[PDB]
Every structure is written in structure tokens, then in C-alpha cells.
């Protein structure tokens, strides 16, 4: 069975402005499953940003805490990253992926990610 | 680290079918096959206590949880799939973060 | 210290052809995997082509037939020859040492340049 | 599904030096090897490596490791380790192209270094 993770909803935003990435997914029930949100910054490596876990419950870095907000919707099978307060140190590549912080899996799949660019 | 529990011996069904139980907040379980130094995630299940656990593929491994042990069911078995699973048991959520390797059930498929 | 410096985008006429190239100092681009992914106003990456290691080339299917990935090892360069464009071909055009499959740390993408699809 | 194999445990002296293999079945290819360290919180990316078979390793990584590729595995040295950098080194296999891709996790190989 073929898996997509299709990201959307980046961009550029200036500082202080608000984005809601989305990760529409096929091949497994979101709302049943847990998933991350990671990001790379220039020059920098992967930080994972949040994490929902099957039953609900999330954790934040706490240099996104306050603000970042993540979420599913059991309708559209879809994940959404709620990112408010952006600064310039929140510009990176952000990937969705059915994968955990804690320790890597062979069935970890990632999306194919989105660019948010926060400059002025 | 964590203690694991799982049946030294399991004889697979006619039908290709063994069962065995894994004893040990938000849970992965994943079943490992020790073939040689070789290891092949056979299958994985991620759950919340109290939920009926998902299986990040549903083809090969059935199961349920009930507290503190998990009772797995692997079904189209041959005899090319004798060997040892090893039940992995990851307390995930909320931390700490537990990491618990069961001994390995020692699965025979005759014929 | 590495740099992907990027270059060759603008302003096209529909059916016409660009060539995108990706300036790279800090790794040997010939034994190298890039990648030349895309971002549309208002939605996510879109991979439109890769080579990797050893030279195999794949494209997406939006794209096939009409983009052309290579590499000059003389000057350590990425290219992008892109042919008979449409306006779904706007977006900003970044170059990557990144395979669609799964990110890394050692993920380094370019700046981006945009490339304009105006009638 | 793959299988990966590495050691279970290898040692690496006051040199620094520690040497471990990194085995999988190619049923093919274009493949990817990164080592990961087991770090309390996360997982930590020590390096990575990418060849078509047949061919000697590009590292991404900046020299931390060196290797070498014989057919379905992968020969890695990892220098300068001290005694704080003993734990779990764990192998992510990507097999890349053609298609289907695959991607396996080792067990980890425990690296213990003295003095």
C-alpha cells in the first residue's frame, strides 16, 4: 500500500504573522496514529518541533512553545502546524512525517516539506 | 531500561498462525526478527493503554492490549519464517522514556 | 563552508525554455545527490527532478519530457533545463543536496530563484 | 521489509578509532547509510554516506567517518571518540533507486571506548 504525506500552506510572512501548514494524508488514519512536525534551519540540522501521539496528547520545544499549535482533523484525514509569533529564527524547511523524536523506525515515512520564509 | 516477558517456545498453526503475549501511557510495540546478527521489523503497533492498538500495517500482525501485556498474532507463516521475534516495548508518553528488549519467542513453523 | 549559489531565473513567455544553474563549492557535485524542487504560491514543495550518486536521473510526472537535470564536474554545477513551460510552472526553483525520500541534518539547500510563467 | 545487521557490541581504545559493518539484503541501486548515536532525548545524525554500488562512499559528513563498500554493506570507521562518546550507534539503511524504496533500522552497534 502506497503512503502520501502532501504538505501545504507554507510561504513567506513577515515577523509577528501567522501560518497553518497542512499534511493531507492517504494509506493510514491520522487520528489514530502519531505524527511530528520537524524543521531544518539554514546551516542547522533537524529539530523536532512537535509531536502528537496516538491518543491526543502533544509536546512543544520550548522554542515554539506558547505559540506553535498542533492539530488533526479526523474529517480530512489531515494534520495542520498552527505557527503564531514568527520570528526569523522560525525560517526553515518543515516536513510532516508518521515518526517520533524518541528513536527511529523502518516504517517512519516524511512528506515532502514546505519552505517558510519569515523575513522583513 | 525495562523488563520484557515473552514465551521461550511458540509452535505456529496448521493455517500459518502463532500467537504469544508480550508483557510489560503512550506505547510502540514493535516485533523484531533475529536472523543471524540480521534484524527485519516484522511489523509495529502504537497505542495509548485502553485503546485498541493500530498497526502501522495491518497485513501481517493482529493483536490487543489489556493493562500490562500485549497479545500479538502473526498469520501466513512458512517454514522459511522459523526463527526468533523479539517484542520491543517502547513507553514513549509521557516520560521518561523506557526502552524494553523482551528475551524472544522462538516461533517454529513445521512444514 | 558550503554555498549553493543560485541563478538563471526571471521572466519567461509560455513554450519558451530557461536554464537554471546551482553554483556549489564545499562538496564534488558528481559524486553528489541534488535535487531541484519547486514551490508554487500558496502550496507546498513539489520535487521535479533528482540525480542521484551514480548519475540516475528521475523526474516527476508534471514534468517529464520537459526538464532535463544534469551536472558539469568541470565546474561543479547543477543544472536545470527547463522547456516548453506553462503558467503551472511558477514558483520559486531550489537546488539541494536532498533526496523526496526522507530530510537529514546534512540537508543544504539554495536560496531559491524565482522563476515568473506570465502570458 | 529488509533486514540490517551490525555487531552487537565493538570496542574502540585511547586512539579513538572504532570499526563496525553495516549489513543489508539488496533485492536490487542507489543507497543512503546514515549512523545515528542514541542520545537520552533524541537521536543524533554522527554522519552519512551515499553510493551507487560498485563505487567508493561520498560522505556528507566533514571526515568524522570513513569507509568502504563491498556489495550489500558497508565498511565504517568512526575516529575520535573519547570515553563520553561510548552508547548505541545505529545504522538507518535507505535504498534508494529504483524503486520500491526501502529503509531499514540495525539493533545499534554499543561502541565502548576505554580511556
Known amino acids: 500500500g502506497e503512503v502520501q504525506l502532501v504538505e501545504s500552506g507554507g510561504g513567506l510572512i513577515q515577523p509577528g504573522g501567522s501560518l497553518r501548514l497542512s499534511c493531507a494524508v492517504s494509506g493510514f488514519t491520522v487520528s489514530k496514529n502519531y505524527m511530528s512536525w520537524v524543521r531544518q534551519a539554514p546551516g542547522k540540522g533537524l529539530e523536532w518541533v512537535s509531536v502528537v501521539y496516538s491518543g491526543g496528547s502533544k509536546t512543544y520545544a520550548d522554542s515554539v512553545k506558547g505559540r506553535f499549535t498542533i492539530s488533526r482533523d479526523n474529517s480530512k484525514n489531515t494534520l495542520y502546524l498552527q505557527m503564531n509569533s514568527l520570528r526569523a529564527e522560525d525560517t526553515a524547511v518543515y516536513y510532516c512525517a508518521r515518526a517520533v523524536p524518541h528513536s527511529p523506525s523502518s516504517f517512519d515515512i516524511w512528506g515532502q516539506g514546505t519552505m517558510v520564509t519569515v523575513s522583513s | ?111
Open chain 2, 1 to 111: 531500561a525495562m523488563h520484557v516477558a515473552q514465551p521461550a517456545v511458540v509452535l505456529a498453526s496448521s493455517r500459518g498462525i502463532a500467537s504469544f503475549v508480550c508483557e510489560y501511557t503512550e506505547v510502540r510495540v514493535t516485533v523484531l526478527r533475529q536472523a543471524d546478527s540480521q534484524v527485519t521489523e516484522v511489523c509495529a503497533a502504537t497505542y495509548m493503554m485502553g485503546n485498541e492498538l493500530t498497526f502501522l500495517d495491518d497485513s501481517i500482525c493482529t493483536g490487543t492490549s489489556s493493562g500490562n501485556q500485549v497479545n500479538l498474532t502473526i498469520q501466513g507463516l512458512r517454514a522459511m519464517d522459523t526463527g526468533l521475534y523479539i517484542c520491543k516495548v517502547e513507553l514513549m508518553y509521557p516520560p521518561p522514556y523506557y526502552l524494553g528488549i523482551g528475551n524472544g519467542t522462538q516461533i517454529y513453523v513445521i512444514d
